Amino acid sequence: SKGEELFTGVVPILVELDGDVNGHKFSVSGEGEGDATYGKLTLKFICTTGKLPVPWPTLVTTFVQCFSRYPDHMKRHDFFKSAMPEGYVQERTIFFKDDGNYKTRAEVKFEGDTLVNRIELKGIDFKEDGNILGHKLEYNYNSHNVYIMADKQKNGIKVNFKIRHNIEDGSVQLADHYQQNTPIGDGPVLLPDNHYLSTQSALSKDPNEKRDHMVLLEFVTAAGI
């Protein structure tokens, strides 16, 4: 495909986010690198407007699936890389069970040799005393399966999955994800058969960092075929 070649080695990544959650405005900048050969991602995010108004874990999914490792036999299903370098639009609605929801819109593409993910996030109907606004989520993350299906109508794909956030009391906060991706360019893209991505992430902190931030290590691999 088109983009495949662009992912052959380590690629620097830039993440920029503007969000408003219940009138709480904030910005995040993140930098790091991805290595699709191993489906590896290493990034550091910084809340540039000060203190993050929501819990970091809630933003992970929002904060570049083109870095997923696709096994040789599954390469023909790699829509993500296929849309590169022109990129794709990734839109979502994330429903927090018994709480508010997040609507996101992002553009992911190359700027020179940097892979850029620019996002706009709008959060509404959050409970002031909920797990989110209330900051009751543990600082960790689970493994999930992300289901992908082709959307021949939009020349894109539809993606759906549920994230499980651990709550400090031992309970769980569900976050239903609904996603659509469409190519930015006019060029041909790879439309896949149903399959899924298997994810794993580790959250950490930078001991020497005083700004509000998050350190993230993540591995993702395609499967189901």
The sign one gets for the Cα dihedral 55, 59, 63, 66 is positive
Residue 202 class from Cβ within 10 Å (0-12 exposed, 13-18 middle, 19+ buried)?
Answer: exposed
Resolution for this PDB entry, in angstroms: 2.0
Domain edges within the chain: 1-225
C-alpha neighbours within 13 Å on the C-beta side of residue 204: 11
**100 near 93, Cβ under 8 Å?**
no
| Fold of the domain spanning 1-225 | Green Fluorescent Protein (2.40.155)
Residue 214 class from Cβ within 10 Å (0-12 exposed, 13-18 middle, 19+ buried)?
Answer: buried
Least Cα distance to 104 among 86, 114, 117, 85 occurs for 117
Q: Which amino acid is at 193?
A: D
